[PDB]
């Protein structure tokens, strides 16, 4: 119900449900 | 119900539901 | 019901539902 | 019901429902 | 119900449910 995220200086952020993401 | 995100300096941000995203 | 996002300096932002986005 | 977004300096912003967008 | 994350300086962040993400 409550989603909070704090990310500083990063890459390839996968924060979801049933998500597909490849890095290359 | 409540979605909050704080991201500084990043790439390839996948924050969703049933999303498809490839980086390359 | 409530969607809030704060992103500074980024690329390839996929924040949605059932979205398709490839970066390359 | 309430959608709020704050993005500074970015590209390829996909923030919608059932959207299709490829970057290349 | 309540998800909170604090990550500084990182890459390949996989914080979701039933997500698929490979780094290479």
Swiss-Prot record, chains A, B, C, D, E:
Q: Give the protein's function.
A: Serine-threonine kinase which is a key regulator of TNF-mediated apoptosis, necroptosis and inflammatory pathways. Exhibits kinase activity-dependent functions that regulate cell death and kinase-independent scaffold functions regulating inflammatory signaling and cell survival. Has kinase-independent scaffold functions: upon binding of TNF to TNFR1, RIPK1 is recruited to the TNF-R1 signaling complex (TNF-RSC also known as complex I) where it acts as a scaffold protein promoting cell survival, in part, by activating the canonical NF-kappa-B pathway.
Enumerate the subcellular locations listed in this protein's record, separating them with semicolons.
Answer: Cytoplasm; Cell membrane
Domain remark in the UniProt entry? The death domain mediates dimerization and activation of its kinase activity during necroptosis and apoptosis. It engages other DD-containing proteins as well as a central (intermediate) region important for NF-kB activation and RHIM-dependent signaling. The RIP homotypic interaction motif (RHIM) mediates interaction with the RHIM motif of RIPK1. Both motifs form a hetero-amyloid serpentine fold, stabilized by hydrophobic packing and featuring an unusual Cys-Ser ladder of alternating Ser (from RIPK1) and Cys (from RIPK3).
Loss of function: phenotype: Mice exhibit severe multi-organ inflammation and systemic cell death, which causes lethality of animals late in gestation or shortly after birth. Perinatal lethality observed in Ripk1 knockout mice is rescued in knockout mice lacking both Ripk1 and Ripk3; mice however die the first days of postnatal life. Perinatal lethality observed in Ripk1 knockout mice is rescued in knockout mice lacking both Ripk1 and Casp8; mice however die the first days of postnatal life. Only mice lacking Ripk1, Ripk3 and Casp8 survive past weaning and rescue lethality caused by the absence of Ripk1.
Supply the name of the protein. Receptor-interacting serine/threonine-protein kinase 1
User: Which organism was this protein described from?
Assistant: Mus musculus (Mouse)
Question: The motif RIP homotypic interaction motif (RHIM): which residues?
Answer: 5-21
Tissue distribution of the protein: Found at low levels in all tissues.
From what superkingdom does this record's organism come? Eukaryota
